């Protein structure tokens, strides 16, 4: 009981933290999610057309 | 500048303020140098009452020009700015940060308009405190003029210890002032500046009162006068009586017989026979 | 950089909304074929 | 690509690192650079061409990055970093405690200003009582 | 040690707040 | 004593002159009260969390579409760099079988 | 409320309020209406800013009125937050900035009767000046 | 700056790129790969631990929590359901790889 | 070798030593420690990281592992708890002695002004 007193207090500090910051750092993540998606599109059409480009070499 | 004005003026004339703000904000890109245009944009922002804005313009200058190569006529305007704003305490701010970072050969333009704003907006204890600093600056830069400036050395020296310095700078600067020693060998031109060494030993010996200091300002004038040209008998009974303070009697007539002995002067004579009649 | 006056001076007390925050038809046709 | 120009700040495509700086730069940038001044734009020590390589991603065994917000090494990490606030937490508490500790044992003078109070009294008492 | 991001926060903070706003 | 001493019919004693029935009350009050100070913080934790939840709920949604999105481009992107790596392997062999026939 | 033909009419309105109350020994409400008389429009308080009510808190005569007023039936700290505001808005007269300068001299705080001098000095330009620094100097010396 | 591993594939605080491949590694994972096998993971190239060059820009930032890792027990809680999908996916591969 | 932090009293992997007092930290805290507080944690003299020197130089079930984790946890907690509980009773016990000081400095005080009377009766 002593022992889960401490933990439900970090775990308060932890909490009011989080509602300070969680919403920006939220944020923050998908702005950095969303550019890997959007770089991954990018190197997955370059991939096709390159794979599209060996199937025209090989017909001509 | 004079075609962004135009431009300007044309967009304030259909009062198109979001307009004519844009073309400021181009203007600085080219025309930043200049400082005024960067204070006109600030006084235009005030003017339009989006305060907040020429407060960030006053301090994007501070940025632009740079926060090491301070800019005087930026921290002057921005200090009146926030004057008049009523942000006293930011627009003193601003000006004893000037007065902190930049040299006192530039500064006085940010000390005349800060002894404008504290005095009006300060209190007695800080509207002396800026004057005293201000005139003590004033002093030190005519005396750098020349010197010989005696009567500045004279005021500076009562107003530092008006004032209450503490010894050591006042001290110091009658160091400063000892060393313009007349370049003349007439008694004429070291009349005034004589007392420049017997206030000296007057502070040693009032305020001070470190004898033994007093004790070396006197010797030390013995050891400037010519004597053999002319003698001052001023500082020799002076310096007599100051040994018969301090029960030095012994001294005294050494001091006094030696007067007598380089330079018989009748004022000498005079004091000597004085003294050893009230003995 | 050198010590900021954004950094030294006090933040201004005499904050204000309109001082320092208010800062700064057609028609069309019907679709394809419809 | 995900690199950052240290330099030029945009996002390169041609990143490439130098041995002495420990820094990311553009080829095209920094080889004129190496060209013009043959110095490390960031730490001013030398360069020279053999100092330099070329970054690259998605080779064969190449893991696939992990997206999910969650792994252990960030579990790991965050555990510590509680570990080593509660440490200096409680060692700050454990110093507060000592402080207190310390002076209210140094303060147990109680039984002794008794003494004093009965030795007052009973002189009190020898003076008021003498008439 | 944990929210150092806030660094970030102010930096987009100051990035936003230079527009509409001067050189340099 | 921070040990020893615990409070028992409305006083401060000793645990040990207590009867062992005592003891057992008194430990129980004890341990009740630890099991209030617990329920007073974890109600005020819930009630921040709940807020969190909600407040949080929609980044952490747009979160979880971004990694299925994201998943699914790898893994195309990956058979699609197997596929180009066997027909450029695949256009070598038709070269040569072109020489042939 | 009503439309007026220059801010001088309203302005003798106001006054006429006051001085009627201030006759009927209405201090409190007399000052109330000289607070709600010279309260500064704010950019939003009126149809237009140009209005003749909109105006009003710039003329001089309705502020030498309620200044008046606070030294017959206010505090002395009262006082200098009208006649200060009555500086701020370049409404004093240098006569009225004398004025101000003898109201804390003559309640003995010379201090603030010299800041009263000073921003009389800030605000006005050549000749204007000349009577507040005349008296500002031979009351320093004095 | 952010970087990922070529091993694991997470975020790594001590990012290093082989003198011998174009690959980034985290430092100690690369080095016990190395003390096994010296040779580049990814290029198969002969590697030594000398030939490693460190990015002393700064690394990767920190997962936000998750509300459910605001508490120690739930963090070891979320550690053990962690553990068990990176077993899974571990025993998941040799499966694969037979297959 | 053995070495233990003077933060945490734990056996440290990465044992330092500050110059300006001669005792050995795990370096992880006493960065911590200096990066918040500033000072040497035992001597209270002004510390800086380059001021650190660094001293010289199994695995069973991770079921298991987890579980030491979780138990050592709950007794790192317990530990501060108690810390927080003993802190507020040395206060009270502190503020309780002061009590007794100034109510003995008042008794003396009465006592000793009512025992000038004894000079006139
Ligand atoms: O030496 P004396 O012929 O007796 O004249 C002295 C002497 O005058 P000079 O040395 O300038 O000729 C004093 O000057 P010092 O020796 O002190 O430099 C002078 O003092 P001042 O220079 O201050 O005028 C003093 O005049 P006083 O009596 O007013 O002190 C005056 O003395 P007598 O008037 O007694 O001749």
């Known amino acids: 009981a002593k022992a889960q007193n401490e933990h439900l207090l970090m775990r308060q500090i932890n909490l009011e933290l ?43 | 500048e004079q075609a962004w004005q135009t431009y300007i003026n044309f ?139 005696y009567d500045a050395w004279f005021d500076y020296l009562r107003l530092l210890e008006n004032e209450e310095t503490d010894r050591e700078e006042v001290e110091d600067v009658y160091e400063r002032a000892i060393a313009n020693i007349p370049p003349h060998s007439e008694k004429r031109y070291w009349r005034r500046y004589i007392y420049l060494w017997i206030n000296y030993a007057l502070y040693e010996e009032l305020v001070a009162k470190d004898f033994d200091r007093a004790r070396q300002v006197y010797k030390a004038c013995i050891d400037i006068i010519p004597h053999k040209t002319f003698t001052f008998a001023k500082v020799w009974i002076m310096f007599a009586h100051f040994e018969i303070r301090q029960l030095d009697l ?17 004022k000498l004579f005079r004091a000597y026979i004085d003294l050893e009649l009230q003995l | 950089m050198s010590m900021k006056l954004r950094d030294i001076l006090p933040a201004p007390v005499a904050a204000d909304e309109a001082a320092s925050q208010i800062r700064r038809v057609s028609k069309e046709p019907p679709p394809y074929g419809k | 690509m995900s690199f950052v120009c240290g330099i030029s700040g945009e996002l390169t495509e041609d990143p490439v690192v130098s041995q002495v700086s420990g820094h990311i730069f553009d080829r095209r940038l920094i080889v004129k650079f190496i060209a013009e001044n043959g110095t490390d734009p960031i730490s001013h020590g030398e360069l020279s061409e053999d100092q330099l390589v070329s970054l690259k991603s998605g080779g064969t065994g190449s893991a696939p990055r992990n997206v999910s917000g969650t792994s252990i090494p960030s579990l790991l990490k965050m555990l510590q970093d509680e570990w080593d606030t509660v440490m200096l937490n409680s060692f700050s508490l454990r110093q507060q405690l000592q402080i207190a500790r310390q002076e209210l044992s140094h303060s147990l003078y109680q039984h002794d200003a008794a003494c004093r109070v009965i030795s007052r009294l009973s002189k009190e008492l020898t003076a008021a009582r003498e008439a | 040690h944990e929210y150092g991001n806030v660094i970030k926060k102010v930096e987009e903070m100051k990035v936003r707040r230079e527009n509409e706003m001067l050189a340099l | 004593c921070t040990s020893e001493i615990i409070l028992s019919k409305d006083k401060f004693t000793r645990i040990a002159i207590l009867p062992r029935e005592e003891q057992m009350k008194a430990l129980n009050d004890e341990f009740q009260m630890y099991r209030g100070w617990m329920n007073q913080r974890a109600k005020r934790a819930a009630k921040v969390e ?21 998943q699914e481009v790898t893994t195309e992107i990956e058979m699609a760099n197997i596929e180009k790596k066997t027909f450029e392997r695949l256009g070598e062999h038709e070269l040569k079988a072109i020489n042939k026939r | 409320i009503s439309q007026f033909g220059g801010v001088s009419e309203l302005a003798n309105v106001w006054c006429a309020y006051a001085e009627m109350e201030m006759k009927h020994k209405r201090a409190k409400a007399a000052l109330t209406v000289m607070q709600r008389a010279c309260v500064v429009p704010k950019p939003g308080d009126y149809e237009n800013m140009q209005s003749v009510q909109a105006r009003v808190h710039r003329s001089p005569i309705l502020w030498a009125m309620y200044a008046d007023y606070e030294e017959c039936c206010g505090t ?35 201090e603030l009767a010299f800041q009263a001098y000073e921003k009389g000095i800030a605000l006005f330009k050549w000749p204007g000046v000349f009577d507040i620094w005349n008296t500002y100097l031979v009351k320093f010396i004095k």
């Not at chain 2, 008049?84 to 006085?108: C, M, V, W």
């Not at chain 2, 001294?251 to 009748?266: E, L």
């Open chain 1, 18 to 60: 989080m509602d300070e910051y969680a919403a920006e750092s939220y944020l923050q993540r998908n702005k950095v999610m969303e550019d890997l998606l959007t770089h991954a599109e990018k190197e997955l059409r370059k991939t096709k057309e390159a794979v599209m480009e060996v199937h025209a070499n090989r017909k001509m």
């Open chain 2, 11 to 149: 967009e304030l004339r259909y009062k198109e303020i979001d307009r004519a703000r844009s073309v400021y904000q181009r203007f600085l890109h080219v025309h930043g140098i200049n400082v005024q245009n960067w204070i006109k944009y600030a006084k235009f922002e005030e003017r339009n009452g989006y305060i907040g804005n020429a407060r960030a313009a006053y301090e994007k200058a501070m940025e632009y020009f740079g926060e090491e190569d301070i800019n005087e006529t930026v921290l002057v305007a921005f200090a009146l700015f926030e004057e008049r704003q009523k942000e006293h305490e930011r627009a003193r701010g601003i000006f004893k940060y000037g007065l902190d970072n930049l040299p006192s050969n530039r500064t006085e333009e940010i000390f005349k308009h800060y002894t404008q704003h504290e005095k009006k907006f300060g209190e007695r204890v800080g509207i002396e405190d800026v004057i005293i600093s201000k005139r003590k600056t004033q002093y030190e830069k005519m005396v750098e003029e020349n010197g010989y400036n």
């Open chain 2, 250 to 266: 012994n001294a005294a007539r050494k001091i006094m017989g030696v007067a007598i002995g380089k330079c018989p002067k009748d």
């Open chain 6, 50 to 70: 709940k807020k969190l939840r909600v407040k949080l709920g929609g980044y952490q949604a747009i979160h979880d579409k971004l990694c299925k999105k994201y």
């Open chain 7, 76 to 110: 002395v700290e009262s006082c200098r937050k009208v006649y200060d505001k009555m500086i701020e808005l370049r409404v004093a007269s240098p006569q009225m900035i004398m004025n101000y300068a003898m109201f804390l001299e003559e309640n003995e705080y010379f």
